[PDB]
Each structure stands twice: as C-alpha cells, then as structure tokens.
A paper describes a structure:
Binding of [name] is mediated by phosphotyrosine-[name] domain interactions, and a major driver is thought to be between the N-terminal [name] of [name] and pTyr-1105 of [name]. [name] recruitment has multiple effects, including inhibition of Rho signaling by locating [name] to the plasma membrane, and activation of Ras signaling by suppression of [name]’s [name] activity when it is bound to [name]. Therefore, in this study we determine the crystal structures of the N-terminal [name] domain of [name] alone, and its complex with a phosphorylated peptide corresponding to residues around and including pTyr-1105 of [name].
We began by expressing and purifying the N-terminal [name] domain of [name] alone, and by obtaining apo crystals of this domain. Of the 6 copies, chains A and B show significantly lower B-factors and improved electron density compared to the other copies and we have based our analyses on these chains. In our crystal structure of apo [name], we observe six copies per asymmetric unit arranged as dimers (chains A/B, C/D, E/F). In both classes, the B-factors of βG loop are high, and in the occluded form this loop cannot be built in two of the three copies, however, when the bound phosphopeptide structure is superposed on these conformations the occluded state clashes with His-1109 at peptide position +4, but the poised conformation can accommodate binding. In the apo structure, we do not observe a similar orientation of arginines, Arg-231 and Arg-212, we therefore infer the cation-π stack to be induced by peptide binding.
Residue numbers in the entry: 178 to 262, 265 to 280
C-alpha cells in the first residue's frame, strides 16, 4: 500500500525514477525539497514529458487543481479511481528496494 511515497526527493532523481518505470501514467509523490511542507505529484506523461504538479498542504488539507483532500493518500486515490487530472494515474512507482548487502 502507498508504495508511491518517496519522501524527500529532488526533481532530477524523481524524473530518473519515473523514466526508469518508462510508461505514461507512472507517478510518485515526493515532499518538495525546494518547498518543504509542500508536495509534488511527479507524473510521466506522453512523449517523454514528466510533469511536476504542486500539491498544497492547507489547514490539514491537501490542494491540487482547486480540489481539496484530507490526505496525500486520498489525493492519489481520487486521480486514480474517480477522475482523470485529462491524464490518468496508472502505475505507482515504488522507491528502489534496499540493495543486496
């Protein structure tokens, strides 16, 4: 569950991880290092374009595209199962597993 949370992660590594997944509709959530306390939905769109959508944390709520959410998980759920953003969240990209010691 919620494999798509990468915590603190810069833009370049986020784009690397999404491009590694390689399919349009791949996504992750990271807490912006440039704007801490805010988050980014990073999303691989068509034609090798990564979009980085700011998500605003306001009043215990989370805002993206004027829609309001109670948790980052609720936000991911909505753009996966209710409506497109219009592109659709399809493949959650999990953080790289720990390496073989």
């Amino acid at each position: 569950t919620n494999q798509w949370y990468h915590g603190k992660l810069d833009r370049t590594i986020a784009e690397e991880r999404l491009r590694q997944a390689g399919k349009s509709g791949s996504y992750l959530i990271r807490e912006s290092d440039r704007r801490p306390g805010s988050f980014v939905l990073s999303f691989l769109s068509q034609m090798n374009v990564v979009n980085h959508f700011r998500i605003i944390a306001m009043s215990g709520d989370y805002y993206i595209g004027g829609r309001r959410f109670s948790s980052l998980s609720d936000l991911i759920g909505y753009y996966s199962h209710v409506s497109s953003l219009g592109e659709k969240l399809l493949y959650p990209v999990a953080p790289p597993e720990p390496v073989e010691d």
